[PDB]
């Protein structure tokens, strides 16, 4: 969640979703753990690597 | 794509291409 | 020596000016392939600048 900004770099960041250099906005984060997963693991995402 | 300065006064120049 | 001093320093002036090419000014090569071949691009901008 912290490699979600304009200047970063990695996997996620450069294969999925880059950012502009000079983006203007806000990111926006919060938890979602006790909603997003579940018992035996949740596997309806997907990322590119 | 990248777009011009003269069509965007506020925003990013980077526009969506995907 | 009145007309070899304006063929010297015109030269002068031509030969400061090439050799600005080979300084730094501050940042950390002078080639300008050597940043864009070394940095990822959003600190290649900086020391381009
Ligand atoms: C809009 O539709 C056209 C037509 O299918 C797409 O053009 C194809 O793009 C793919 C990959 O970019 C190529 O392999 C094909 O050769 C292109 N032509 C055809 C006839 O398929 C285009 O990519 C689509 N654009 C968007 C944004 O969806």
Do not use: H, M
């Not at chain 3, 002036?13 to 392939?33: M, P």
């Not at chain 3, 940043?35 to 901008?45: F, G, V």
Request: proline share 4%; glycine share 8%; hydrophobic share 35%.
């Amino acid at each position: 969640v912290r490699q979600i900004a304009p200047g970063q770099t990695g996997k996620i960041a450069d294969y999925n979703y880059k950012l502009p250099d000079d983006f203007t906005g806000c990111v926006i984060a919060w938890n979602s753990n006790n909603l997003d997963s579940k018992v035996g693991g949740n596997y309806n995402y997907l990322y590119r690597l | 794509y990248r777009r011009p300065r003269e069509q965007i006064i506020i925003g990013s120049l980077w526009v969506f291409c995907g | 020596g009145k007309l070899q001093d304006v063929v010297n320093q015109n030269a002068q002036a031509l030969n400061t000016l090439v050799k600005q090419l080979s300084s730094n000014f501050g940042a950390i090569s002078s080639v300008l392939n050597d940043i864009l071949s070394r940095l990822d691009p959003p600190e290649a901008e900086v020391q381009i600048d």
